Design a protein around this ligand. Structure first.
Ligand code: A1BML
Ligand code: A1BML
Lengths: 268, 269
């Protein structure tokens, strides 16, 4: 992997592994999400971010601040097959004092065609109190050194899916998967549940017949609260329709919302 | 006219006037460009900018700075007819240290449909030395108070026309209109040549047959240097192409110094 000539974006090639593919011998959406996170980490390291798992700036470390994902949106046109090489380009953009964005474009290395795109919204959080906050002047200045200053968006279209408001699923849910618990493989190097695990948990309540007869085209996931190592989650799903679903992850005990999202599926 | 509910954009309605229309009884592209400038001025006044003809901030007046247009890009799907009401929404965005952008959406007031869109790039300049510069931290902070912080673009599409690099027309030009001079009606309240005058001058070298048989769809104009009140301009045009496309160059009649370059795309009626 490497920064591009202008130093404002990063590219990396990945060979899809045997254990990374589903029943149709193509990468799962979780494999895709792990690759987006990996190229994001490799970009942060190349532009001088911390190497402790938190990917923080100098000012963020002095103020005890960390980034937390607020939203992940992924659209796949073609999932790469086992053994195929997929190239991913990523870049960041500052969004005033609201937070920052990380965008990605996925290409077939052989054909050069775009096979997918993704966007993520990140918000500042004080690491100790867990309280959200605005992005300060000093942090906005650090982002100007490695981000394009003119807008560059993976999802440019006006009123596109990536910015849609997601409603809250009302009981009773059409489908559910109860008692989901993370194991050590679900934790990152800082013992927090990895963001990709929540995508897997959302997908657990989709009926196996849908997965067998449809391809996942779009997934939009909001993040509200974290699942701890000893927490238990229930994954709920209702058809809103292509097939479209509304999703909700909540703690098994008190029913506290951890995530909400939507998925759009195309018949194979 | 008024700021919208969130206070991050501005809207205004205009009734197209008799002297504002061309041969097909619809607004000229110069009428459209004047309306964009007017709604831009009304937005700046509503968010606390100076009222002297230079749309300046408190920090800009302190540092003797002004904005200058670097590029204007306009795309029209339907020109409003004489007597029609056109609604225009405008907003600004900060582009880091490079400069700022002002975007516009034009709608038919009756149907609610988008009839056109425009975007403009602005660069900081010291008013005394005329030297270009980067946008300072204090100016970027002033723009955050009245601009949307998430990107809002009139031209979102990937490699869209509004960002295309424009080449320099090589002599000899296919067409030309020589000896163009501005009169007092071409000057703004600060005695500088109005930006819309340059659009008119570019269009002067398009043959009348093209204007009679085609409608202008897209115009992209780069601004490099200003024409003074006593300067004389030559307008040059060469066809580069059902659509007709042209390359344009405005230069001073004497020494041939470039003042503007641009392109136009026309569709057969
Ligand atoms: F994205 C987000 F909404 F900002 C988000 C994601 C994940 N956690 C949070 N928290 C939990 C701790 N205290 C309130 C904020 N918030
Ligand atoms: F857009 C632009 F290129 F920045 C521009 C437009 C108009 N004038 C100028 N300059 C800068 C150099 N000194 C003379 C005035 N520059």
């Amino acid at each position: 992997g490497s920064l591009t000539e202008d130093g404002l974006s990063y590219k990396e090639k990945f060979v899809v592994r045997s254990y990374e593919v589903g029943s149709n011998k193509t990468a799962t959406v979780e494999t895709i999400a792990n690759l987006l996170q990996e190229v994001g980490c490799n970009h942060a390291q190349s532009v001088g971010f911390s190497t402790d798992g938190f990917a923080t700036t100098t000012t963020m470390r002095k103020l005890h601040l960390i980034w937390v994902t607020a939203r992940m949106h992924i659209e796949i046109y073609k999932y790469p097959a086992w053994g195929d090489v997929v190239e991913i380009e990523t870049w960041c953009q500052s969004e005033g004092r609201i937070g920052t964005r990380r965008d990605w474009i996925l290409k077939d290395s052989v054909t050069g065609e775009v096979t997918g795109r993704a966007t993520s919204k990140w918000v500042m959080m004080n690491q100790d109190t867990r309280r959200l906050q605005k992005v300060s002047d000093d942090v906005r200045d650090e982002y100007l050194v490695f981000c394009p200053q003119e807008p560059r968006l993976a999802f440019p279209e006006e009123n596109n899916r990536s910015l849609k408001k997601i409603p809250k699923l009302e009981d009773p849910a059409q489908y559910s998967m109860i008692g989901l618990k993370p194991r050590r493989a679900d934790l990152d190097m800082n013992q927090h549940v990895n963001n990709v695990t929540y995508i897997g948990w959302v997908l657990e309540s989709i009926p196996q017949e849908i997965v067998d007869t449809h391809e996942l085209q779009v997934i939009t996931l909001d993040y509200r609260r974290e699942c701890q190592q000893d927490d238990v989650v229930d994954s709920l799903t209702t058809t809103t329709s292509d097939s479209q679903f509304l999703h909700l992850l909540r703690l098994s005990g008190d029913g506290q919302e951890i995530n909400r999202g939507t998925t759009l599926w195309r018949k194979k």
